[PDB]
């Protein structure tokens, strides 16, 4: 699994620090001009993420694809990668088996009226929608999957070919180093081994699989970042209360200045920590996006002639599946 | 913070719901007698008096009309708060002590008063009030100061190690009884308390003045705990952000008719962060609470046409009405969208593959140059289809023309 | 586990701080016995004074509907079903010895006497001073051994007055309970705001411990005893165990109806410390 | 940000040390200078952390720049996607204010025509079997048995010679030609 | 030389902040809840 | 750097909690221990980043 996109979050600094109280807002504009800088940095991060998403999906785009390649095979069963939405059955399996909560768009606020989904509208942050719908990403993935019929072959992406999957696999193994006699002798055992490998791959989404745990850990890390942002509004930071209203009710003006000042300092520290974490995750996402482009253009759009890349063993064929 | 801005789908500030009403409950709590402070004789510092008041109301204007405050020392509260806000319980420790020795009750003092007679506790909010009951008020009431007033200058065991007084505790009964038994002052004298010997000290004082004024010290400890705030001063809608005051707990939130949770005896239901997520009331009905949430607002602006549009992110447009008075003084053009419904946009079926104003999930905002944007989808350009032949021949798509394309990075 | 005061929760885990007892703490065991020959049969309970500390919690009953040993008859043919008895408790600040005989447990000055009066239907918390009564072979004589709150089988204050003098008596508070044969919890703490009592006969059918009867007692309680209790006639009764509260961290969980079902000692072993750490 | 953050009072009465020294007493001066010190040290720490993060980003981009120079510029790349879009032809380097500016020249096709092809050709009688290299064997438009060679990246039907075909081991999926053999098979 | 592994360090947050003083520990738990997040993040980096 | 920030007073009278508890009263102890806590938490957060 390659984590190519960070979670895009916009935080309203005024609402997060002061929660609408005018005395806090006066104290915060006396404190400094932090909120505009926070908003500008956190908007630049999201703009860079959108540009990285477009640059990633240009590489998945192919000039030609074969829509009937995955269904017109020999003894190979590639029903896990058929476009029937264009989301494949393995994409459905992967997205169903991961414990990911639904990000509400269109009606999230209404549902929150009547966790971390409903914590957005009470804390001050908002998780932005991704640049592409899951349906369009499924079209890109299906078009890439249909284009691996003859992409590895003598047509080096300038032209397209329409070999069936059996002939393409036969050419792959030969160039690997298996002689044609051996491949012609075994035209049923090889297909059976490939089919049972894909079956164990289908069944293998458990807690033992390392890549599925990587997907789950990425989702959990995003949830932990949002929970850390949301749970620091309950900290007193050395004050009598974590609420501005209780401070305004109980104390006089001179002491209210000190208590609101320490609350403001703690919440600005939380915002700065979140922004720096988003910057570090953005650099990690840029590296992983470059790796994703290299592995698509080396493993999926061709056959790798180099060892240790495109998995263990010696590479035959690769497929790509959208992740959360 | 600038006036020449660029294009982009920015994120604007949240707009918070206002108040649509007021709700009040009090459970009709009776006045608790604070006249016990001025009823009997004024207490000795060694034998000082403590009362705890719960489930009552008090009229502070009558109480402060009987005394003249010389100086009040409050920590974590103010006397304005104790005349306005409610709290869980009230503790009053009162004793007679003259103003000439009020520095002994100051924090950090090395006098015998703090370490043997009254050790104030500062873990909870407190106010130490030095007031004087005048002679005319003293005769109007039955308040007198005719006792023999003395404090404890020594409370020592047979070990010879002093026995200090812990914060927020009354005086040890052995040293208290030994000091109040002796009628004359003595710095060191033996005392056998019920089988154990004690060496004690007695030093006298006089709180009465020449005018007859009895000088008093009142230590007030308002306790702010979770749940109902049943000690209040005598002061004179479903689905909406409304102001409340259920049991002296004041704030704002959204009220719903809700299925009962928790124990009905404990009125307030809390979360893990000290937030009230519901309450039980009279007539057996339960309401679960939530703070009134805010609409997230995004602004779409284009520099070339100087036209701005406003995206309300992930909101259903029905709900805009209820909070329609919380936005700016200009906010209609109603239109549902997959990234949250938006104002200022016309729905079009046009598709453009490359757009500079992305609204989210495969959505764009086409520039006007009308005076408004156009809602256009992202275009997925279909690749050229190549058909698989089921024979020994196979289809190829070979280029016939080309151009030298320049990419730069 | 003492319930949080003034509030409730539902399906939440909270790390509460307060007065909690240790895990696997074998508390002190006390049993009451029936009359042996027509005279009270009691134990060493009256002459031993324990330490109040930060407060105590009592597992009340918890052994009913089992086969019980009459203390005067160890033969298993005489064994019968245990009944439920409520203890008589005595809390004070200064403890010495009665003058005439030199027997411990005198309990000078004011003291809180918790008595289960009537046929186990009212619990009485009366706060005043016990002085010896100059009577023959009684408290304040040469032929005194111990005092018994002797009762019949279907007000112990009259027996207490038969063994002590009731003077300077500040309040006498009565609380209504039902006669049952069940597990119950009873707990007493003391703070600046007074003496707080806890019981399990509040709300619906749980082992939790809710506050009631905030008594106006502000002098520090330092000692407690269990006043021996006997019932005139074979019979068998349950036991109660007393555990001491400590200032420790303690992680609990609630349910749907707002009752604590399970808790964590937070310091019993390394695993509970790690559970509190995360 | 580094320059403008010095103007923040950070909760003090002023953002200048001299005004605080002029107005307040020594005990208050300690508090105000302490909160200004805390704010400015926080600013310096934030700048140093930003510098470290951009340093790791620059290390990654320097590795990428080395790889792209040694692949795109000193040689001609055969791995698609890397060295730009399309199939790489030639690349140049241009200095930039904070890095390097690459210009990749790529072969981008415009038109496409569908064609039928064969894995190879065999002669019934001699079982000699040839396969095309760097191209395909496409059918002729005026005969059902005439085969021509075409390039992979461009379309032009050419006669089959020895220089654009290789001799390979026979396969069952090759076309078994009978008449009008090409000169390598003739 | 390629730096392929970091120095794995575990820090006890409560001991480092307060050095075993009970008053400091009360003030720290009144301050907020930071030590659990520090331990979780600093254990996650070691696991990775 | 992690070890050397336990000797910083951060504006308090001392870098040791015991000296603060020995010298000052309770209300000043809260302030001094709070600023020491803030400094040490800042050091821990810098180390984790
Ligand atoms: C707290 O206690 C004070 C008493 O010290 C209350 O003040 C009293 O308020 C009543 C009602 O307003 C006053 O009665 C009025 O008297 C005039 C004639 O003087 C009469 O014309 C009116 O119809 C009314 O009966 C009373 O004079 C006044 N006394 C003083 C000394 O101020 C105060 O109202 C109490 N606070 C609350 C919230 O109840
Ligand atoms: C000794 O036996 C008696 C009688 O069997 C036990 O009293 C019974 O205790 C159970 C506790 O589970 C009570 O059940 C409760 O019933 C209510 C509905 O009334 C239900 O909502 C609760 O969840 C719970 O199941 C039962 O009512 C009660 N019997 C009577 C007559 O009150 C006693 O617990 C036994 N003692 C020991 C130590 O085993
Ligand atoms: N007259 C009389 N009074 C009694 O109290 C009495 N008690 C018993 C039996 N009492 C008991 C008490 C504890 C355990 C016991 O084994 N305790 C468990 C507790 C397990 C847990 O903590 O959940 C243990 O093994 O520790 C057994 C019998 C029998 N006859 C009696 N007879
Ligand atoms: C300390 O003050 C209390 C309160 O006045 C005294 O308690 C009173 O004692 C007298 C005489 O025994 C009783 O008549 C009153 O009813 C008691 N009142 C209350 C409220 O308890 C107590 O005696 C004083 N202590 C000493 C040693 O003199
Ligand atoms: C005669 C007193 C002044 C001279 C002191 C000389 C040396 C003692 C040095 C330090 C002890 C000072 C404590 C004084 C306490 C007074 C404040 C109070 O607790 O009320
Ligand atoms: C291919 O695999 C899918 C999923 O394992 C299965 O449902 C289907 O029956 C298989 N088809 C064949 C022909 O084996
Ligand atoms: C906007 O137009 C498209 C195409 O005409 C249509 O599918 C969609 O339902 C329209 N939006 C709404 C809210 O009706
Ligand atoms: C109790 O809380 C848990 C949270 O882990 C939840 O799954 C469960 O549904 C809750 N019970 C009820 C009755 O709501
Ligand atoms: C009985 O109590 C006395 C207290 O006077 C004590 O000394 C003795 O050890 C006790 N004996 C037993 C067996 O508990
Ligand atoms: C009690 O003790 C005293 C002194 O120790 C002694 O004189 C007296 O006789 C004792 N009383 C009895 C009953 O033993
Ligand atoms: C305790 O009792 C003794 C004698 O019984 C008495 O002198 C003393 O005053 C009492 N103490 C209190 C605080 O009442
Ligand atoms: C028990 O009842 C008998 C008969 O009424 C009575 O004489 C005796 O005093 C009673 N004893 C007690 C302890 O109640
Ligand atoms: C307690 O019960 C008695 C019956 O013995 C009754 O007379 C009394 O009114 C009850 N008190 C309360 C407060 O319910
Ligand atoms: C105890 O019961 C016996 C048996 O009837 C009786 O003789 C005796 O008087 C009773 N004693 C008391 C004090 O009730
Ligand atoms: C191109 O495709 C069409 C439709 O499938 C087919 O009739 C035609 O023969 C193809 N061209 C060649 C050269 O085979
Ligand atoms: C070509 O001839 C071979 C026999 O040498 C045969 O196995 C193969 O099927 C033939 N392929 C055709 C007819 O294209």
Give DSSP secondary structure letters for C158-175.
HHHHHHSEEES---EEEE
Q: F49 and A238: CB-CB below 8 Å? A: no
- Residue appearing with tokens 């992690």: F2
Separation between Cα atoms, residue A84 and residue A139, nearest integer Å: 11
Chains B, D: CB contacts within 8 A come to: 93
Query: Within an 8 Å CB–CB cutoff, is residue F37 touching chain E?
Result: yes
How much distance in Å is there from the Cα of C131 to the middle of ligand 10? 19
CA atoms lying within 13 Å on the CB side of residue A275: 24
| Touching chains C and B? (3+ Cβ pairs < 8 A) | yes
Nearest to F11 among D34, D45, D49 (CB): D34
The Cα C121–Cα C119 span in angstroms is: 6
Full DSSP string of A175-192: HHT--HHHHHH-SSHHHH
Distance of CA E39 to the CA centre of its chain: 5
| Strand-pair partners of B256 | B288
The beta-strand segments (E) located in A101-216 are: 125-127, 160-161
Q: Is C184 in the pocket of ligand 12 (CB under 6 A)?
A: no
Contact yes or no for B339/B365 (Cβ under 8 A): no
Q: Do D45 and F49 touch (CB under 8 A)?
A: no
User: Which tokens in the block code for residue B17?
Assistant: 């719901």
Sorted by sequence, the CB contacts under 8 Å of residue D58 that are 6+ apart come out as none
- Token pair in block for residue C134: 């100059």
Interior angle at CA A309, CA A306 and CA A315, nearest 5:
70
| Secondary structure class of C16 (helix, strand, coil) | strand
D115 in contact with ligand 15, CB cutoff 6 A: yes
CA-closest candidate to residue B364, choices A143, A322, A136? A136
Q: List chains adjacent to chain D, taking adjacency as at least 3 C-beta pairs closer than 8 Å.
A: A, B, F
* Residue bearing tokens 């940095």: A41
| Residue E37: exposure state from Cβ atoms within 10 A (0-12, 13-18, ≥19) | buried
Give the integer Cα–Cα distance in Å for C87 and C196: 18
CA dihedral A102→A107→A108→A110, nearest 10 degrees, is: -140
Cα(B95)–Cα(B117) distance, integer angstroms: 11
Residues in contact with B80: Cβ distance below 8 Å, sequence separation at least 6, in sequence order: A252
Contacts of F36 in chain D (CB under 8 A): none
Residue A284 near chain F (CB below 8 Å): no
Interatomic CA distance for residues A20 and B292, integer angstroms: 12
Q: What spacing in Å lies between the alpha carbon of C116 and ligand 14's midpoint?
A: 21
Which residues contact ligand 10 via a Cβ below 6 A?
C 101-102, 142
* Beta-strand runs (E) in C177-270: 184-191, 194-199, 210-215, 223-227, 229-231, 236-237, 239-244, 246-253, 262-264
Q: Which chain B residues contact residue D173 at CB under 8 A? A: 392
Gaps (C–N > 2.5 Å) in chain D: which residues precede them? none
Q: In whole angstroms, give the CA distance from residue A83 to residue A68.
A: 10
- Cβ neighbours of E42 (radius 10 Å): 17
Q: Which of D108, D136, D145 to mutate to test the interface with B (most CBs of B within 10 A)?
A: D108
Tell me if B47 sits within 8 A of B395, measured CB to CB. Answer: no
Q: Which of B148, B241, B169 is CA-nearest to residue C93?
A: B169
CA of D138, closest atom in ligand 15: 13
Q: After which residues is chain E broken (C to N over 2.5 A)?
A: none
Angle subtended at Cα A310 by Cα A307 and Cα A316, rounded to the nearest 5 degrees: 85
Which residues, other chains included, contact B20 with Cβ-Cβ below 8 Å and sequence gap of 6+?
B237, B240, B241, B242
Bridge partners of residue C51, in order along the sequence:
C223
Main-chain dihedrals φ then ψ at residue A221, nearest 5 degrees: -70, -40
In this structure, the residue with its CA closest to atom 4 of ligand 10 is: C102
Q: First vs last Cα of chain B: how many Å apart?
A: 32
Q: Is A232 on the interface with E (CB under 8 A)?
A: yes
Angstrom CA distances, B83 to B22, B51, B64, B128, B251, stand at: 21, 19, 11, 16, 18
Pocket flag, ligand 11, residue B178 (CB < 6 Å): no
| B109 to chain F: closest CA residue | F25
Q: What are phi and psi of C184, to 5 degrees?
A: -140, 155
Token reading at B261: 């949770």
Cα separation, A122 vs B253, in Å, equals: 11
Buried b (16+ CB within 10 A) or exposed e, B366-382: bebeeeebbbbbbebee
Residue listed under structure tokens 């209360």: A241
Q: CB neighbours (10 Å) of residue B346? A: 13
Q: Is residue E25 within 8 Å of E14, Cβ to Cβ?
A: yes
Q: How far apart are CA A86 and CA A78, in angstroms?
A: 15
Ligand 10 atom 7: the closest Cα is on which residue? Answer: C102
Residue B272 touches partner F, C-beta closer than 8 Å: no
- Cβ contact D87:A158 at 8 Å: yes
Helix (H) or strand (E) segment spanning residue E1: none
Q: Using CB atoms, which chains have 3+ pairs under 8 A with B? A: A, C, D, F
Question: How many Å lie between the alpha carbon of C94 and the closest alpha carbon of chain B?
Answer: 8
| Pick from B158, B87, B181, B161: nearest CA to B125 | B87
The pairing of strands B384-385 and C210-215 is unpaired
Q: How far is D97 from chain F (nearest CA, A)?
A: 30
CA–CA distances in Å: residue C43 to residues A220, B106, B348: 61, 52, 93
C29 contacts C253 by C-beta, under 8 angstroms: no
Q: What is the DSSP letter of B227?
A: S
Residue of A nearest to D134 (CA): A154
> Which residues in chain A have their CB less than 8 angstroms from residue B399's CB?
158-159
Quick one: resolution in A?
3.0
- DSSP per-residue letters across B97-140: --GGGGGGGSTT--SHIIIII-----SS-EEEEEEEE-HHHHHH
- Which residues fall within 8 angstroms of residue D124, CB to CB, at 6 or more apart? D176, D177, D178
Q: Is the CB of A79 under 6 A from ligand 6?
A: yes
CB proximity list for B321: less than 8 A, separation 6 or greater: none
E strand or H helix that includes residue D31: helix D26-68
Q: If DSSP codes are grouped into helix, strand and coil, which group holds residue A167? A: helix
Among residues B10, B20, B21, B90, which one has the least CA distance to residue B57? B90
In chain E, the residue whose alpha carbon lies closest to the alpha carbon of A263 is E31
A156 neighbors D87 (Cβ within 8 angstroms): yes
Q: Do strands C149-151 and B268-270 pair parallel, antiparallel, or not at all (unpaired)?
A: unpaired
Q: What is the DSSP letter of C104?
A: B
Closest chain B residue by Cα to residue D172? B392
- DSSP element (H, E) containing B53: strand B49-53
At residue A284, the 3 state secondary structure works out as helix
CB within 8 Å: A122 and B358? no
β-bridge mates for residue C166, sequence order: C130
Asked if A9 and A223 touch (Cβ cutoff 8 Å), the reply is no
C47 lines ligand 9 (CB under 6 A): yes
Token reading at A150: 């003859």
Taking CB atoms and an 8 Å cut-off, how many pairs form between chains E and F?
A: 43
- Residues 6 or more apart whose CB falls under 8 angstroms from that of D25 comprise none
CB atoms within 10 A of CB D186: 8
Q: Which residue has the tokens 């791959």?
A: A201
Ligand nearest to the CA of B336: 7
CA dist., res. C17 & res. C20, Å (int):
8
Burial of A254 (C-beta count, 10 Å sphere; 0-12/13-18/19+): exposed
Q: With beta carbons under 8 A apart, name residues in chain D contacting A276.
A: 46, 49-50, 53
Looking at the partner chain, which of D30, D38, D49 has a beta carbon nearest the beta carbon of F49?
Answer: D49
Give the distance from residue F15's alpha carbon to the nearest chain E alpha carbon, in angstroms.
11
Contact A2, A117 (CB under 8 A): no
Sign of CA dihedral F23, F25, F26, F29: negative
Please work out, in degrees rounded to the nearest 5, the angle formed at the alpha carbon of residue C88 by the alpha carbons of C105 and C40. Answer: 80
CA dist., res. C55 & res. C59, Å (int)? 14
What residue in E sits closest to A217 (Cα-Cα)? E44
Q: Do chains F and C touch (3 or more CB pairs under 8 A)?
A: no
Chain F touched by A273 (CB under 8 Å): yes
**In chain D, what residues touch B399 (CB-CB under 8 Å)?**
109-112, 153-155
Question: Measured between CB atoms, does F26 come within 8 Å of chain B?
Answer: yes
Q: Chains E, D in contact: 3+ Cβ pairs under 8 A?
A: no
- What whole-number distance in Å separates Cα of residue A215 and Cα of residue A97? 11
CA–CA gap between residue A306 and residue A315 (Å, rounded): 8
CA A287 to chain centre: 13
């Amino acid at each position: 699994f390659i984590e190519t996109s960070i979670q895009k979050v916009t935080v309203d600094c005024k609402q997060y620090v002061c929660n609408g109280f005018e005395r806090c807002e006066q104290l915060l504009v006396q404190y400094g001009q932090f909120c505009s800088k926070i908003n500008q940095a956190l908007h630049g991060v999201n703009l860079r993420q959108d540009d990285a998403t477009k640059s990633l999906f240009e590489d998945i785009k192919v000039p030609q694809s074969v829509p009937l390649m995955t269904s017109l095979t020999g003894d190979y069963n590639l029903s896990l990668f058929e476009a029937p939405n264009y989301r494949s059955a393995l994409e459905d399996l992967l997205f169903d088996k991961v414990t990911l909560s639904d990000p509400g768009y269109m009606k999230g606020y209404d549902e929150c009226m009547k966790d971390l989904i409903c914590a957005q509208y009470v804390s001050g942050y908002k998780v932005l929608p991704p640049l592409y719908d899951a349906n369009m990403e499924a079209m890109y993935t299906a078009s890439l999957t249909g284009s691996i019929a003859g992409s590895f072959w003598t047509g080096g992406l300038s032209s397209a070919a329409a070999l069936p999957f059996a002939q393409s696999m036969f050419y792959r193994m030969n160039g690997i180093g298996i002689t044609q006699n051996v491949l012609m002798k075994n035209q049923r055992e090889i297909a059976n081994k490939f089919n049972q490998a894909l079956g164990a791959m289908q069944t293998g989404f458990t807690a033992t699989n390392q890549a599925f745990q990587k997907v789950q850990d990425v989702v959990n890390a995003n949830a932990q970042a949002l929970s850390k942002l949301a749970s620091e509004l309950a900290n007193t930071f050395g004050a009598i209360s974590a609420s501005i209203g209780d401070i305004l009710k109980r104390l006089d003006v001179l002491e209210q200045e000190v208590q609101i000042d320490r609350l403001i300092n703690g919440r600005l520290t939380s915002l700065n920590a979140f922004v720096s974490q988003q910057l570090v995750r953005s650099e990690a996402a840029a590296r992983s996006s470059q790796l994703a482009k290299e592995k698509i253009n080396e493993c999926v759009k061709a056959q790798s002639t180099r060892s240790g890349f495109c998995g263990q063993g010696t590479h035959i064929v690769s497929f790509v599946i959208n992740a959360p | 913070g600038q006036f020449d801005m660029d294009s982009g789908v920015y994120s604007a500030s949240y707009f918070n719901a206002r108040s649509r009403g007021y709700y009040y409950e009090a459970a009709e709590l009776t006045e608790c007698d604070l006249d016990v402070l001025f009823k009997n004789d004024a207490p000795i510092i060694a034998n000082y008096s403590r009362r705890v008041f719960t489930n009552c109301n008090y009229n502070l204007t009558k109480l402060l009309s009987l005394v003249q405050v010389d100086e009040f020392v409050c920590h974590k509260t103010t006397p304005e708060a104790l005349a306005t806000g409610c709290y869980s319980s009230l503790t009053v420790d009162w004793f007679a002590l003259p103003f000439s020795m009020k520095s002994t009750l100051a924090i950090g003092s090395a006098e015998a008063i703090s370490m043997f007679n009254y050790n104030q506790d500062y873990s909870n909010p407190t106010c130490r009030i030095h007031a004087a009951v005048t002679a005319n008020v003293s005769t109007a009431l039955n308040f007198t100061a005719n006792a023999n007033y003395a404090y404890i200058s020594r409370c020592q065991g047979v070990d010879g190690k002093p026995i200090l007084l812990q914060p927020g505790q009354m005086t040890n009964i052995a040293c208290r009884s030994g000091v109040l038994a002796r009628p004359s002052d003595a710095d060191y004298f033996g005392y056998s308390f019920q089988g154990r010997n004690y060496y004690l000290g007695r030093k006298s004082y006089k709180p009465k003045t020449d005018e007859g004024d009895v000088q008093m010290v009142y230590v007030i400890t308002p306790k702010y705990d979770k749940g109902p705030d049943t000690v209040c001063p005598l002061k004179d809608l479903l689905g909406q952000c409304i102001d409340y005051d259920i049991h002296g707990v004041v704030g704002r939130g959204v009220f719903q008719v809700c299925n009962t949770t928790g124990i009905a005896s404990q009125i307030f239901v809390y979360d893990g962060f000290g937030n009230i997520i519901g309450f039980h009331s009279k007539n057996g009905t339960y309401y679960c609470m939530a703070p009134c949430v805010s609409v997230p607002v995004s602004v779409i602006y284009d520099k070339s046409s100087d036209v701005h549009a406003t995206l309300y992110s992930s909101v259903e447009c029905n709900h805009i009405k209820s909070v329609a008075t919380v936005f700016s003084r200009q906010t209609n053009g109603l239109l549902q969208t997959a990234v949250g419904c938006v104002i200022g946009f016309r729905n079009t079926s046009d598709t453009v593959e490359d757009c500079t104003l992305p609204l989210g999930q495969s959505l764009c905002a086409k520039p006007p140059s009308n005076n408004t944007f156009a809602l256009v989808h992202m275009l997925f350009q279909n690749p050229l289809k190549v058909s698989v032949l089921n024979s020994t021949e196979f289809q190829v798509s070979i280029p016939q023309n080309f151009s030298f394309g320049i990419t730069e990075e | 586990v003492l319930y949080p005061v003034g509030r409730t929760y539902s399906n939440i885990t909270i790390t509460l701080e307060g007065l909690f007892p240790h895990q696997a703490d074998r508390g002190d065991m006390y049993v009451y016995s029936q009359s042996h020959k027509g005279r009270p049969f009691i134990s060493n309970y009256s002459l031993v004074t324990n330490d109040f500390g930060n407060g105590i919690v009592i597992r009340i009953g918890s052994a009913a509907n089992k086969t019980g040993s009459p203390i005067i008859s160890n033969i298993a043919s005489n064994f019968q079903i245990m009944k439920k008895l409520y203890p008589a408790l005595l809390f004070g600040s200064a403890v010495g010895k009665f003058p005439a005989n030199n027997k411990t447990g005198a309990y000078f000055n004011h003291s809180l006497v918790i008595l289960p009066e009537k046929c186990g239907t009212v619990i009485t918390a009366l706060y005043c001073v016990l002085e010896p009564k100059n009577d023959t072979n009684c408290t304040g004589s040469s032929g005194y051994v111990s005092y018994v709150l002797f009762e019949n089988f279907s007000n112990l204050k009259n027996s207490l007055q038969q063994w002590f003098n009731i003077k300077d008596c500040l309040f006498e508070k009565n609380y209504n309970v039902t006669d049952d044969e069940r597990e119950e919890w009873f707990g007493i703490i003391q703070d600046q705001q007074g003496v707080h009592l806890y019981t399990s006969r509040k709300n619906g059918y749980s082992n939790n411990m809710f506050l009631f009867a905030t008594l106006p007692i502000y002098d520090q309680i330092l000692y407690y005893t269990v006043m021996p209790r006997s019932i005139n006639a074979y019979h068998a009764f349950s036991a109660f165990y007393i555990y001491k509260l400590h200032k420790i961290n303690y992680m609990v969980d609630f349910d749907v109806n707002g009752y604590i079902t399970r808790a964590v000692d937070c310091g019993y072993n390394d695993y509970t410390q790690l559970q509190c750490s995360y | 940000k580094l320059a403008s953050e010095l103007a923040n009072t950070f909760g003090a009465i002023s953002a200048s040390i001299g005004d605080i020294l002029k107005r307040l007493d020594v005990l208050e001066q300690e508090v105000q200078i302490d909160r200004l010190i805390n704010g400015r040290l926080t600013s310096l720490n934030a700048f140093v952390s930003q510098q470290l993060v951009r340093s790791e980003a620059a290390a990654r981009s320097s590795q990428l720049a080395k790889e792209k120079i040694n692949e795109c510029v000193k040689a001609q790349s055969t791995r698609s996607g890397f060295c730009g879009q399309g199939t790489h032809i030639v690349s140049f380097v241009i200095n930039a204010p904070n890095g390097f500016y690459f210009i990749h020249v790529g072969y981008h096709p415009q038109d496409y025509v569908n064609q039928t092809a064969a894995y190879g050709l065999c002669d019934s009688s001699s079982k000699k079997c040839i396969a095309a290299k760097n191209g395909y064997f496409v059918k002729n438009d005026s005969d059902s048995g005439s085969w021509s060679y075409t390039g992979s990246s461009f379309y032009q039907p050419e006669p089959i010679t020895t220089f654009n075909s290789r001799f390979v081991e026979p396969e069952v999926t090759f076309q078994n030609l009978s008449n009008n053999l090409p000169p390598p098979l003739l």
